[PDB]
Amino acid sequence: KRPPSAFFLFCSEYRPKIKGEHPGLSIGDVAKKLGEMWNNTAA
DNA sequence: CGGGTTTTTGTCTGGCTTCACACTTGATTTGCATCACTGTGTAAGACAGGCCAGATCCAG
């Protein structure tokens, strides 16, 4: 159901970067980082 | 006016679930306001007025 898109793959691939490089915070900071990274780069 | 005898329950007690709860952003899906119109209103009766007809009256 609900076939994902390029952004969902971006999330599922680049969230573990911040989840393993800085595990001291919850994935709220990881989402915030991934979002400020996507907004600064292209698609 | 209040003594017996079961119901009706929140806990004490601490330790096992299954759901609850921060963030995105780009869609995707619902929810709701807006606009020019609609149908149901739906057959007879009362009254004045012109018109001849025939009754009402006049005079040789």
Curated annotation (Swiss-Prot):
Function noted in UniProt: Multifunctional redox sensitive protein with various roles in different cellular compartments. In the nucleus is one of the major chromatin-associated non-histone proteins and acts as a DNA chaperone involved in replication, transcription, chromatin remodeling, V(D)J recombination, DNA repair and genome stability. Proposed to be an universal biosensor for nucleic acids. Promotes host inflammatory response to sterile and infectious signals and is involved in the coordination and integration of innate and adaptive immune responses. Nuclear functions are attributed to fully reduced HGMB1. Associates with chromatin and binds DNA with a preference to non-canonical DNA structures such as single-stranded DNA, DNA-containing cruciforms or bent structures, supercoiled DNA and ZDNA. Can bent DNA and enhance DNA flexibility by looping thus providing a mechanism to promote activities on various gene promoters by enhancing transcription factor binding and/or bringing distant regulatory sequences into close proximity. May have an enhancing role in nucleotide excision repair (NER).
Family: Belongs to the HMGB family.
Residue numbers carrying Cysteine sulfonic acid (-SO3H): 11
Organs and tissues of expression: Ubiquitous. Expressed in platelets.
Documented effect of changing residue 11 to S: Inhibits oxidation-dependent inactivation of immunostimmulatory activity in apoptotic cells
Full protein: residues contained: 96 to 138 of 215
DNA-binding region, residue range(s): 1-43
Note: Proposed to contribute to the pathogenesis of various chronic inflammatory and autoimmune diseases, and cancer. High serum levels are found in several inflammatory events including sepsis, rheumatoid arthritis, artherosclerosis chronic kidney disease, systemic lupus erythematosus (SLE). Seems to be implicated in other diseases characterized by cell death and damage, including diabetes and Alzheimer's disease. Its nucleosome-associated release during secondary necrosis may play a role in SLE.
Induction: (Microbial infection) Protein levels increase upon infection by human coronavirus SARS-CoV-2.
Post-translational modification N6-acetyllysine, affected residues: 32-33
Annotated stretches, region: Cytokine-stimulating activity: 1-13
Organism (species): Homo sapiens (Human)
Descriptive protein name: High mobility group protein B1
Compartments where located: Nucleus; Chromosome; Cytoplasm; Secreted
